[PDB]
Amino acid sequence: NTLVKQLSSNFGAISSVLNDILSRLDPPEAEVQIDRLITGRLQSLQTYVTQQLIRAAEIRASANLAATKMSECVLGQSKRVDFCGKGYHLMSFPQSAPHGVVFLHVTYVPAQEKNFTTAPAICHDGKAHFPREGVFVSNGTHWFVTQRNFYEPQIITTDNTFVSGNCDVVIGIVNNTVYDPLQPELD
Amino acid sequence: GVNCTEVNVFQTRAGCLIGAEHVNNSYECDIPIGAGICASYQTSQSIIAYTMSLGAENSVAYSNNSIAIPTNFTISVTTEILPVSMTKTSVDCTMYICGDSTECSNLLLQYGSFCT
Amino acid sequence: AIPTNFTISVTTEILPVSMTKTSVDCTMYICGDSTECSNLLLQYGSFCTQLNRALTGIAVEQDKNTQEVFAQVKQIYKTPPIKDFGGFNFSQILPDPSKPSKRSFIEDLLFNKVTLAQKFNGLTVLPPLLTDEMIAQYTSALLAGTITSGWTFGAGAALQIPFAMQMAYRFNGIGVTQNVLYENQKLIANQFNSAIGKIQDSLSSALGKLQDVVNQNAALNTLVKQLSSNFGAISSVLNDILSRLDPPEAEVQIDRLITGRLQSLQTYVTQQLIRAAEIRASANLAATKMSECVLGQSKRVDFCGKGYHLMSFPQSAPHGVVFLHVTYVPAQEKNFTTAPAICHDGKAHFPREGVFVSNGTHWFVTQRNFYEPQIITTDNTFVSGNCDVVIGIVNNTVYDPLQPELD
Ligand SMILES: *[C@@H]1O[C@H](CO[C@@H]2O[C@@H](C)[C@@H](O)[C@@H](O)[C@@H]2O)[C@@H](O[C@@H]2O[C@H](CO)[C@@H](O)[C@H](O)[C@H]2NC(C)=O)[C@H](O)[C@H]1NC(C)=O
Ligand SMILES: *[C@@H]1O[C@H](CO)[C@@H](O[C@@H]2O[C@H](CO)[C@@H](O)[C@H](O)[C@H]2NC(C)=O)[C@H](O)[C@H]1NC(C)=O
Ligand SMILES: *[C@@H]1O[C@H](CO)[C@@H](O[C@@H]2O[C@H](CO)[C@@H](O)[C@H](O)[C@H]2NC(C)=O)[C@H](O)[C@H]1NC(C)=O
Ligand SMILES: *[C@@H]1O[C@H](CO)[C@@H](O[C@@H]2O[C@H](CO)[C@@H](O)[C@H](O)[C@H]2NC(C)=O)[C@H](O)[C@H]1NC(C)=O
Ligand SMILES: *[C@@H]1O[C@H](CO)[C@@H](O[C@@H]2O[C@H](CO)[C@@H](O)[C@H](O)[C@H]2NC(C)=O)[C@H](O)[C@H]1NC(C)=O
Ligand SMILES: *[C@@H]1O[C@H](CO)[C@@H](O[C@@H]2O[C@H](CO)[C@@H](O)[C@H](O)[C@H]2NC(C)=O)[C@H](O)[C@H]1NC(C)=O
Ligand SMILES: *[C@@H]1O[C@H](CO)[C@@H](O)[C@H](O)[C@H]1NC(C)=O
Ligand SMILES: *[C@@H]1O[C@H](CO)[C@@H](O)[C@H](O)[C@H]1NC(C)=O
Ligand SMILES: *[C@@H]1O[C@H](CO)[C@@H](O)[C@H](O)[C@H]1NC(C)=O
Ligand SMILES: *[C@@H]1O[C@H](CO)[C@@H](O)[C@H](O)[C@H]1NC(C)=O
Ligand SMILES: *[C@@H]1O[C@H](CO)[C@@H](O)[C@H](O)[C@H]1NC(C)=O
Ligand SMILES: *[C@@H]1O[C@H](CO)[C@@H](O)[C@H](O)[C@H]1NC(C)=O
């Protein structure tokens, strides 16, 4: 719209339209006004072209980002935090749009919590067991082992822990028992 | 860029605001006036100019032997919108600069190679 | 070759985020208090609205950049009065209430470094939206959340956890087991404190990244000095050219001045769009780095620091952001003699998640990023086929700890 509206300014000539210039006046005395008009219109074209180039560069950067998001969120599962949505990522679906793309991001997200008391090791008989891929939680009397993203408690045994060292160097430790289920079945 | 000595005058850090009551509360930003202040219409009604609030404020009972475990999950669906392309418009330089004339074209030919 | 010791190492990284806003009048700069100039300028059409529109767009984009970079949280957390973090000393990064503002020792030690007439020609500067105290509060809230929750606050609610167990999770995320941390916690705490002290010393005696922005935005001097040029006229003062001539002969002089000053404004505005685009790209990179290094644990090699990644802490330099990556590098190595498979009775025994090293005579299985030899039991490996296809294999025996109990 601005590029069009630039076509009605004198820029210094006696009129803003070329046909009037060439009809009312003799060309050897009209070349100067024609030069003025040509200079003005060239300036307008240069301005428009430069700004369009900058806009195109920005749009290209955005399109590259959109292509990367399509390649990683949709055709696979991502772990880049807060890339494909907000929270843990399950999958995404693409949807077209006029001159754009719209993504739908199904995302796992945790809810209602429950306080607990923890400890990093268990001195059974001088040794010190450690959880394999869990965390030691106690409701207040008995100690359990659960995964770190969902409360599911199981009885602590010797198939959830692996010994390492002795229970005199770990800063926090608590005495407890370990089931060792082989012994009852041995009888 | 003036002081309120010159021409409901709540002197800001960003200038001289005229026509807005100054309240003591803290809400979210509707009109980003600048330098912290943000004006809004929700106060029978009059425009107010309050100070920003960064959000809520809470703490966690962090302790050396306390942990919190989630017990129930939920599933959410969000959206994000990204432009990809725009219109492909070309402009003929001669038809715009000149018209249907010929002397205009002959004079434009002196400027070398701009249209190309 | 396997390491036998490790050393924590803290390094920084400086990124610019935004640049000074600027709105430039395109009528006071050209004409001034005159009116003949204001009438002559009207012929050029809409050449005094597009420049203003572009400059306001740039300013809005700067506000957008800062908001995207720093506003990653909704709740504003607070460090507890309890200061029991298992050995680490976070008393050079957390805010100090004694100072007038809430900038910590590193933050104001950094603000001391960078040093941040023109107006009467029509050149005006605008104030930022988020005042510096708000930025400091954002950084402090991010620090408190990271310290007291690790990453869970970046994906929903905030879940409390002891810091030592959080570092255990961090080590377990890069391959090394957790007993490795739980055995020598004091050494790691001391190394962390020493690294933080060394960084504090280093920053107290560079910041070229944040200084190039200022030395390029202060353009303004060239724009100002493009006023004492005749541009082909007889004198570069409108109040003089209209006090020594008459309209028919003053119009050409005024027109030449108009053309020159319009070219100068066009060049300035053109440069301050390319600079803005570069700054926006840098701000986007900084936002990504915040969201991935700070609110999680990165796996991309050499993204957050150099080495393996544990955690990071943000800061706030003037017109930028500063990270402190906490890396992990192994130190002391030893030669060994490995072998992919150990077949006992015609049954190859590949290791589960370790490696089959030997100290010359015996054979022990150990993990990769550290050294802790063990015995080749049955639960430590798994059988696969018979040993006649594996290229390099040495013949040995396993322990099978089920035997002693059944006697
Ligand atoms: C979880 O955190 C604290 C502590 O609760 C205890 O945590 C263990 C030590 C164990 O003994 C648990 O069985 C206990 O439940 C509490 O936080 C309180 O939250 C209320 C919310 O209204 C607040 O008014 C109190 O000031 C908080 N107390 C402290 C000391 O900060 C509460 O039990 C749990 N908090 C939440 C938010 O669920
Ligand atoms: C904490 O957990 C322990 C271990 O489960 C609970 O003790 C038993 O729990 C089972 C169900 O899990 C009940 O059927 C038993 O009656 C419980 N035994 C006793 C002696 O109480 C215990 O109840 C839980 N709660 C507390 C407060 O300790
Ligand atoms: C967690 O910290 C508390 C202190 O906040 C420990 O409780 C004891 O607190 C008294 C306070 O005077 C100290 O003198 C004791 O030294 C603390 N006990 C110990 C063992 O240091 C509590 O024991 C701590 N828990 C763990 C697992 O370290
Ligand atoms: C987890 O949350 C869901 C949804 O809030 C719970 O499902 C509801 O449970 C209540 C009570 O049993 C029912 O009346 C509703 O019909 C259930 N569905 C919905 C959509 O509300 C579910 O019980 C929760 N699980 C746990 C373990 O708390
Ligand atoms: C691993 O390296 C650390 C240093 O990064 C060693 O820690 C030093 O240990 C000696 C005595 O063993 C002390 O005198 C020093 O004060 C410790 N710190 C430093 C910075 O030197 C540690 O001993 C090394 N571990 C092994 C097994 O060699
Ligand atoms: C490789 O490590 C084993 C570890 O068991 C070494 O075995 C020791 O050998 C000495 C030789 O007299 C015995 O006294 C020890 O009882 C053995 N066990 C331990 C734990 O020391 C073996 O010597 C090492 N090989 C080499 C070449 O150093
Ligand atoms: C565990 O038992 C030992 C003795 O068997 C005792 O010295 C210690 O105080 C107990 N409690 C711990 C280690 O927390
Ligand atoms: C602006 O006006 C206020 C109120 O009179 C005065 O306190 C302040 O000093 C003034 N500032 C300047 C720069 O004149
Ligand atoms: C509002 O704040 C001002 C400045 O602190 C104070 O003078 C005034 O009493 C406050 N009014 C109310 C109603 O809190
Ligand atoms: C942390 O370091 C400062 C400065 O050396 C010291 O004053 C303070 O006591 C230290 N805090 C702890 C817990 O070591
Ligand atoms: C391993 O042996 C090579 C060859 O002699 C030697 O250069 C290298 O230093 C040895 N590695 C160690 C850790 O001693
Ligand atoms: C492979 O194991 C057999 C046992 O059946 C043994 O005789 C042979 O020496 C072993 N191979 C080598 C190279 O020692």
Numbering used by the authors:
A (entry chain A): 960 to 1146
B (entry chain A): 614 to 620, 641 to 676, 689 to 761
C (entry chain B): 713 to 828, 852 to 940, 944 to 956, 958 to 1146
Task: Give sentences copied directly from the paper behind this entry.
The spike glycoproteins of coronaviruses are responsible for receptor binding and membrane fusion during the initial stages of virus infection. Viruses that have spike proteins containing the amino acid substitution D614G are currently predominant in the severe acute respiratory syndrome coronavirus 2 (SARS-CoV-2) pandemic, and it has recently been shown that G614 viruses have higher infectivity and produce higher viral loads than D614 viruses. In this study we present high-resolution, single-particle cryo-electron microscopy structures of the G614 spike variant showing that it adopts a predominantly open conformation, unlike the D614 spike that is mostly closed.
Strikingly, the structures we solved show that the G614 spike exists predominantly in the open, receptor-binding-competent conformation, in contrast to the D614 spike; 87% of G614 spikes have either one or two erect RBDs, compared with 17% in our D614 structure [and less than 50% in the structures of D614 reported elsewhere, none of which showed two erect RBDs]. With a glycine residue at position 614 a salt bridge cannot be formed and thus the structures of the G614 spike in the open and closed conformation are very similar to each other in this region and, importantly, similar to the open conformation of the D614 spike. The greater conformational flexibility of the G614 spike explains how it more readily adopts the receptor-binding-competent conformation and suggests how the presently circulating strains of SARS-CoV-2 might have fitness advantage over the D614 variant and display higher infectivity. We conclude that the D614G substitution promotes “opening” of the spike, priming it for binding to the receptor ACE2 and possibly for its subsequent role in membrane fusion.
